[model samples]
Target: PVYPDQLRLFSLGQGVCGDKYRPVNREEAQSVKSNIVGMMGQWQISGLANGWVIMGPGYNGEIKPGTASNTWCYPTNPVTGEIPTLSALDIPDGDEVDVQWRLVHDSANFIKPTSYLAHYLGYAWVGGNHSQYVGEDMDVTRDGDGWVIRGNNDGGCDGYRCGDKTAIKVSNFAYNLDPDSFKHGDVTQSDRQLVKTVVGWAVNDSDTPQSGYDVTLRYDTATNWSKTNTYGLSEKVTTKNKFKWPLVGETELSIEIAANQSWASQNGGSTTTSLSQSVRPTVPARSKIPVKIELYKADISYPYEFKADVSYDLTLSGFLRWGGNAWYTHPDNRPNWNHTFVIGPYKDKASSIRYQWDKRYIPGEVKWWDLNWTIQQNGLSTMQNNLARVLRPVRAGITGDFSAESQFAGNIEIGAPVPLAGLRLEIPLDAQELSGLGFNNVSLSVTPAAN
Candidate 1:
């Protein structure tokens, strides 16, 4: 099989396609959304190698290299160049927006080894500027089970592969996103704008006892944000998987399991497990903060495998500043940092990362191509808060076993200017039923411990 000359990457979601997924213009394309496995429907693919996929306006509308001209790229730790990071913004106001970010250096043709997790890592800003940067406290998430890979099927038994392929999957992980904030209102426009404030950040993952699904999610309210008190939303809902796989057709499912320990990390094993009815619980009451669903969807399936794929596509998205709302200004209020007691691309390897951003400012001129420019940026004012946002790159701290190849592995951190949540998984698809009925059978599980 053809291997990537370097490490392969995959972005959560959204991309520009050309310019290798680097934004061509920042002004025109302010942010991009990164799509995790849990964001789409269930049914993971098999035999997908690790690599990079651009998210958001990756390449600024440029034609991508492989299958799709411009595919989404995943974020990576600039330091270790391993796991990629997906940053979500939390404004001072009671507004929570989705920013757009892209993955890098991945393609359908050249995939990574299957044993690796589709790992991701990065930092957050509690407060900063319209540019979102150093402020209050920051968060770091690592120890997550990235994406997994399975083998292909043989047209032997059912005239189709039908559950005979290797799949990409994850079992357990340790993730944390810190620096909690609170919002007193809805995260959007209209009367539906209920408030949400995170009194604290939540960190968890899936494991053997729990099914290892790591998470760093929170609630908060600042100038640009207003919300209720901090409560465990994951505590209410049980299915907490950010990523899972096995797609027969165009259908996809992605969601961050409420807790980390849920799904079982097995080896192509199937069991007649006890299936339960879907649970629709009420949004928990917060510290006087009302709760609302900004976006929510779930999928299920079960079928045999054919010449199916076990890989899932990744992407990213975000806002221009903290609040992401027009009424807000100066971004979020991020505390200052000495820039000394921190560890990231800025500390020592700031130069190499400099090529990621621009030095001069050109309001309204921030085109998509600018994102593709190789201009390096200096360290931020500080690394204190997480409200302010930035497209800074990060590196991974821990690496998994090589014997455990063909899997996705990423590092996750919590406590930033904005509240955040994420997940990584290995989804399974039923080729037989999928080919016959055009879909796959799937399920979700959430836990508080890492296997």
Candidate 2:
């Protein structure tokens, strides 16, 4: 390969599109300071514009740039006007140097990757076990998969220096071509994509539709993917949130559903949708929390899916424990949980939950409303659920299915009629969806009293 300063040139005009030159004579030669400078400039510009990659130091000594031996050619850096030193090409330092640098001779005049710098899928280097490594750039280490990618022993670093008592301790990071290794890179941390946009759904009585968002799903200190639902079937209109990203650690996926207003205000303010769960990220993951909602009448027994074979025992018992002020299990000042209460067997996973909504709120100001139950099962688990959970994902919220299953210890959390007082209202339970989720024939009765 020719260096920038040594690029060949024609004394006369080479071509119409090629370098236009004056006949090499005392005149033009003087202009170019002997044709060298002008030709060097052209080589430098062409090398950059045409796209060339940088090659790190590697083995050299096969007298050939092919798959036959540990040797390959490197495109001269037209800017530096220099080729690798004699020592580098004569004696290798890193493993499978020539191949790692992609010095193939298939049809080689020069094959470029279209980028100015080499596209490092991930980084590699010897571990501290190798005295040569000056530590790592990215948060990677030999502690993981260990270093040396090719220990096949064919006159490479593994054959020569690595894992040896008296050797150069050459570099070791498996190239993209190398196998059985993690995606190690110097920029892996910052490499993870930040996320945004969370979408959710809220359901209530058709008599008085629940609208507007009173909660916020905070993913990171910088993100609060929160929003409200428009007027549509509770299952049809989805509540959406925007902005958020994070990776690693016991991430917090909390939703503060606050809807505290007077009973007479009928203009439709906001709804309470509070929920919180603490979850840790996994080496891989998807986090979705399935929540259930319900309504109940006073004491031990009341109407429920009549003949539908349902008891109201799980309902009245919630009030017996409320009078003491130990109302909220999550974090709150006053008992933030409204008309609705919840019972969960909340199992942890490679995921997390921040906060929850009050399954109970005055449907709508003074507007009249319901009977039965309202279940937020459709997309209750919003984009916010996964968007605010997954760490180093393929595309954060863009790629991969981020979902999880927890032992939702099926129970009846009845909502109190605090605001509506004695107004008998209801919300039909979507047992179809519930059964669809494999909960049919699943009786939710009580533990009979003992004498």
Candidate 3:
């Protein structure tokens, strides 16, 4: 409602009352300005004007200067006191209106402005760097839920707008409010953990409750998940059942997670669902081959003739005990094997009957040290049968001498002899030689004796 005194102020504008502000006295000018402000407030509240409006305390429409009473409006340059013309808010030619401006209702006076320039200038039009806004050309509206911003004619640019285009329901967006969705909760340090030997993880999707998802467990290039241990409704999926370690040919265990389509599509299909990690295991040292051989002789000597039997027992023993005990062994610690031999038996006597033994190198039988009969034994013997001869003076007769030579195949070679005071000479097999024969058993018996 415009008062008669306020109407007279509008009539004073332009040539109708040129220089009227100087003609009227200071008190009269002040009175007219006061009435005009009152009229402006009334017109703004009634939607007749689109500019600043003052409101008093207690939400009661009154104009007063006080702490609680304040003014709120829009579209005026507060610094220059400049306001746009009616043509700026009206649509006529090809000029497009600035739809990015949003009006805020001032509860103090119940006054709604055309723009938030005087109150708040933010939420500006999406004409430049700000590409996040949708439906730049359309108007924003309210649905049952909340604000609905729509798209436009050229496939609809997204902005804070609404109406009969591609509409985005802003209110329908759900937040992480379901506590039941978090399976493992915070997964603090108190939770179960694995050592350096084995690897695993504790998974939980409680934050995404009621959501369908699929998780794949992978090691190396193959899928390692089983039906019972896979990620289904049990939001927390772990690798407890599928503990993987590096094998012979492989150096590292490559781990990876591949989410199913259900999980990917729900959280923006463009998100990366395939990720990979690699883990390596510690490899132990190689072990020594274990092998042993025993040579024995049973003989009786007379002045006329001597009968003797020499035999060697070849044995491979304690495969499980070789490498610091079998319990701490790996496949790489096993041995390699091969054996060959040459033996000679000759009766070295001037008066004794001629006796000779000759044979080419023979290969020994091969066997695994880990088996039950792991000890492989191959024996060759020298035998002599006494023949009674007429004694020159009771039993003074001929004597024979025999000899044996052995050579192991592969790397097997006799190491230094065990030096013990007054003890029988014992040969130690070379460690490298033992490994070459796979720690196989080898034996030789040759008696080169004189009587």
Candidate 4:
């Protein structure tokens, strides 16, 4: 573990690449890539040359550099086939773009993530004038599994390029490391990290006064580990010395000591000095809320194939919470969800109904376009008795020979015209894509009803 000032020179150049460098053998590098979903294979970086000051435009348009390595600058103009000029407000319509920044490692070397920033997925950078920074600079903190990136422009302290400064920039946040324990130091020796160890004493009041005891405080926690052993009574017991504590809420500790004659006797005991010991745990001020996700639908079974062309509409319901409290319930504000389908005349012809969900968005934020359902099932009793009520998913797959006994409860039908005022209009497709299957435009709608 070499300090920054002690680090070799050649090892520092990697930071210049910003978000484009990766350790060939590091498992973290691979794990970070797995989180990326929507990806573009090509990038457009405008050359620094042929532009006056590269006003924010060209450098901020579609196909700009990623924050992992290069700054958000577009490459040479694609149509002009030459270096592009820069101007303010260059984010072109329909051009996907992002902002990039310099990456610094553990206060010493900096390396860019060539693939993506595991921390910034599904997040967007909003444009606005940042508050001025004082003399402070970028501040980083590792909280839990994520980072709390903040910039301190206490004044108007600018970056290498002048502007309102960023004072509390943060990255590399995790539970094992945190703001209270893992401090971010500047590029200096003494200013290594920005954290401190706050200490306190614990005593067992019921024990004899000045009791010689052993204090063992284990900061054993996944969130935070900050522990130390301090002895108040000299001859009473031994003080435990430990480094580091969990970043989570304070934890339990074990303090052992024996009442000895040499211990402090505040009670004025004549025969033998009474030994007293007490323990009171306290933690420095800072905190964060934790979150966990549970998938209730994971066990639902399904069929591999369908009997004939069928249509079905799927609905989901659930509740969500935030800040240790229930925020919203499932099926809350469930809008646009009625369905209408016409059964295609066929025996046990091939048919299927598929409903794929996007977990990224909160249930309420999800729009009608996000939910997709396709159905192809066995022929129903009649057009009025469409498979809407018969379509069910498998539940007892292991033993039942893939029977319908383990299906979910629901009803389906394809009868008279049922106006679906709440359902969103589905996307249309050309006949060529459907082959012999004729398209009968379906209608959908939704209305609140007691569950």
Model 1 scores a C-alpha lDDT of 0.22
Worst 10 residues of 1 by lDDT: 94-103
Global Cα lDDT for candidate 4: 0.20
- Give lDDT tens digits, candidate 2, residues 53-76: 111222111011111111112223
lDDT of 3: 0.21
- 1 or 2: which has the higher TM-score? 1
Question: Candidate 4 at residue 48, lDDT?
Answer: 20
List the candidate 2 regions with Cα displacement exceeding 4 Å. 1-165, 168-411, 414-434, 449-451
| Overall lDDT per candidate, in order of appearance | 0.22, 0.20, 0.21, 0.20
Better of 2 and 3 by lDDT: 3
lDDT of 4 by residue, 1-451 (tens): 1111111111223223123332221222223222211121223222121221111222332322222322212112111111121121111111011111222222221111100111111111111135322112334444432232333334443332233221222322111101122222121111112121212222222322322322221111111111111112222221122222111111211122223322122111112111222221221122111111110100111121111111112111111111111112223332222212111222221111111111212355333222211011111122112222223211100000110101011111112222222111122223342222211221122221221
Best by TM-score: 1
Output the lDDT of residue 333, model 2. Answer: 29
TM-score of every model versus the real structure: 0.15, 0.14, 0.13, 0.12
RMSD list, candidates in order: 30.6, 35.0, 52.5, 38.4
Q: After superposition, how far is residue 392 of candidate 2 from its true place, in Å?
A: 21
In the range 252-355, model 3's lDDT, one tens digit per residue, is 21222233212112211111122222221111122111122221111111111111111111111112212221111223342321111111122232112111
Per-candidate count of clashing residue pairs (backbone under 3 Å): 261, 37, 22, 90
Q: Which sequence of candidate numbers ranks them by TM-score, best first?
A: 1, 2, 3, 4
Candidate 1 deviation (Cα RMSD): 30.6
Q: In model 4, state the lDDT of residue 46.
A: 20
Q: What C-alpha lDDT, on a 0 to 100 scale, does residue 46 get in candidate 2?
A: 15
